[PDB]
Structure formats: C-alpha cells, structure tokens
Amino acid sequence: IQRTPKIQVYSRHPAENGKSNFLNCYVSGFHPSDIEVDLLKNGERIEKVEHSDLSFSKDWSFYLLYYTEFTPTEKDEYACRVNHVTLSQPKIVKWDRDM
Amino acid sequence: HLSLLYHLTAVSSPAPGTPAFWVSGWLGPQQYLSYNSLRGEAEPCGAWVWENQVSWYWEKETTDLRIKEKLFLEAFKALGGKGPYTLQGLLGCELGPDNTSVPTAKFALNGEEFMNFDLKQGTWGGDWPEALAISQRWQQQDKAANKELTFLLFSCPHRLREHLERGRGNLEWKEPPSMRLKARPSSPGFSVLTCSAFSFYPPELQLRFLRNGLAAGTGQGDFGPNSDGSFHASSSLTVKSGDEHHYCCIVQHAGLAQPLRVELE
C-alpha cells in the first residue's frame, strides 16, 4: 500500500530574529520509505542539512526529520520541499513562524 | 510502564548508498540504538552514548541484529519475483504490572500487518500466502525460532531492566515547553490563532483554548520531534477578526507544576 507524507515545518526554539536556531522539516505517515526532502531559503536549496534515522510509527508508516542550523530574520522565507511516489509533483510547505 | 522496541526494516531494492536493512531501538519515546547493514554495527544514540554499560553490551546487540538482518533478507527470497518489497518488524517487550515481561512481535509487508511470532508455540504465522511462505522459510532455518524466543523472552527484558537501572535519569527527563500564542490574518473576517509548544519532553502534552476564560476547544494541531529527541507541538483555532484578544491557551505538561496560561503576543 502507498501512503502520502504529512509535512510539518517549525523551528526547534521560538524564532527570534538574529538568534541562532534550528529549522525542522518533519515528514511522516508515508509509504514506501524512499523520500526526497530539501530545505529552501527564499527558494534556494540549503546545502548544510542533516536528517534523523528513517523510522516508523505503530501504523507502520515511515517518518523522518530534516533539520538545519539557521538564524531567522524578518524578511527571509523558508520552506520544505518534498518528493514522494504518491505525489504528482513536489510539495512545498512554507515555514510559518507561528507554528 | 516503559517499552523497549526495535523497529526493523528491510527493502528488496535499496537506493544506492542506502542500507538494505536498518534498525532503530527505542526506550519509550526516545531512541537509544541505531543499526544498519552498511555499517553492520549496533551503536548508541543521544545520551545513551554516555551510559555505563556491561563490557559486552553493544557487541551482543550487534550479534542479534546481524542475525535478524540475515532473516529479513531471506524473507524476500521466500517470496520470489521482482518486487519491490518492504518488510518491517516491531519486536520488543515491556514490564507488566506484576514485574514480568510482555513481548511484542509483529511484522508488516509493504505497509500492511501480515505476520506475528507466537511465543507459546515458537512459530511465525499469518493468513496471507506471503506470511506462510516467509514463516516456513524462517521456521526451517536451524535455531531461528530458538533465537527469536531467547531474544524476546530473555534478552529484551534483560536489556530493558539494565537501561532502567543505568539510564533512569535519561528516562525521567522532564523539559517544559517554551510557549507562544500568536495570531495571523486569514480569509476576510477571520484570523488564525496558533498556540505553539517548543522543545519539550516527554511527548505527552495538552493544549487547550479558552475564550474569556470559558472552554473554546482543543483547536486542530500537530506534533513532531526535534533533532535531539525532544518534541514540538502546535494547535490552531480559527477566530473572528478583531476577537483574538479574548483568547488564551492553556498547556499541561509534566515539566510544569501546574497548567500554564499563555497570553497573546
């Protein structure tokens, strides 16, 4: 069976302009396990991105955390871009600083 | 009480540079173990790197998981055909109310639960022909059932008790969430209020909205991990534009002594 990913984007700590932080893209609920994820800064792919181990939940769906160290500013926009076999095109989820 | 659970996955055609087989081990909601078939060594995670263990602890975890690696890869040969296949296992134990071990041994094929291990008979089984095929292949392998029995009935509870003793402080960790409540405009006449909880542990957390001190619902939200195994959560409520200041959020979490009221920024 195939399951399409849920995507969440949030910082590790409350965002404060000029304070170092981490940006997370948490992708979960998907099957099969092959997935492609990029963090974007004003549309540009971020190079220094790490990710947790591919693991899975009680319902057997897979999940994965991508994260990158960053310093938010007032004007810079961040997003997460995800490709998976269930998706007809890559899904882009913008970082909402409130979330 | 707390569970030790191994999450095992094999894939029949791994992408290049990725493992055909990998494992994560969990003590309740935090990961203590990693293993993959490319490195071939079981390793500690996070604070468990600094745990004081018995001299042979990690080599024995490695020994057991190399055995499961071979079994999972044997499973694909029992199915035959082009695939691709994903085989997952959830193996572990938890201590029960009377201080005995309760085993877990379930498997899924291509995302669907399809097989278990029966500890009373020492046999794998399931209804699908894929279950019968894999179970028979595993059942015919010398000492495979015996090693599965030992793993679940003896090794797992022994490991769980050792980690409860040597890492009790890691498991009792209580980090209270940093809270924020913020509104943003939405469709005309409406705003979206978001209560957000940052970097907390353990994952159990409640967020509730109040309107003029009266219950206004849980809102809709989500939760997820941070890179260090702490967690993050948010919940959001649609409210009428101009009414946002009547709302607050309440959070309950074990790192706090009382429910905490969070006011709008």
Numbering used by the authors:
A (entry chain B): 1 to 99
B (entry chain A): 4 to 268
Task: Share the article's original sentences.
To obtain structural data for our analysis, diffraction data for FcRnECD crystals, at pH 3 and pH 8.5, were collected at cryogenic temperatures and structures solved to 2.0 Å and 2.45 Å, respectively, by molecular replacement. Two copies of FcRnECD were found in the asymmetric unit. The FcRnECD crystallized with two copies of the heterodimer present in the asymmetric unit, packing in an anti-parallel fashion. In particular, SiteMap identified a ligandable site at the interface between the α-chain and β2m. The respective boundaries were predicted to vary with pH, with the area described as either one large or three distinct cavities. No regions near the IgG binding site were found by SiteMap. Additionally, motifs within the HSA binding site were also conserved. One of them has previously been identified as being critical for albumin binding and was the site of a protein contact in our pH 3 and pH 8.5 crystal structures, between the two copies of FcRnECD in the asymmetric unit.
FcRn facilitates new-born humoral immunity by regulating Immunoglobulin (IgG) transport across the epithelium. In addition, it has been shown to bind to IgG and Human Serum Albumin (HSA) at nonoverlapping sites in a pH-dependent manner. Existing as a heterodimer composed of β2-microglobulin (β2m) and a membrane-anchored α-chain, FcRn is homologous to the class I major histocompatibility complex (MHC1). FcRn has been proposed as a drug target in the treatment of autoimmune diseases, in which pathogenic autoantibodies are detrimental to health.
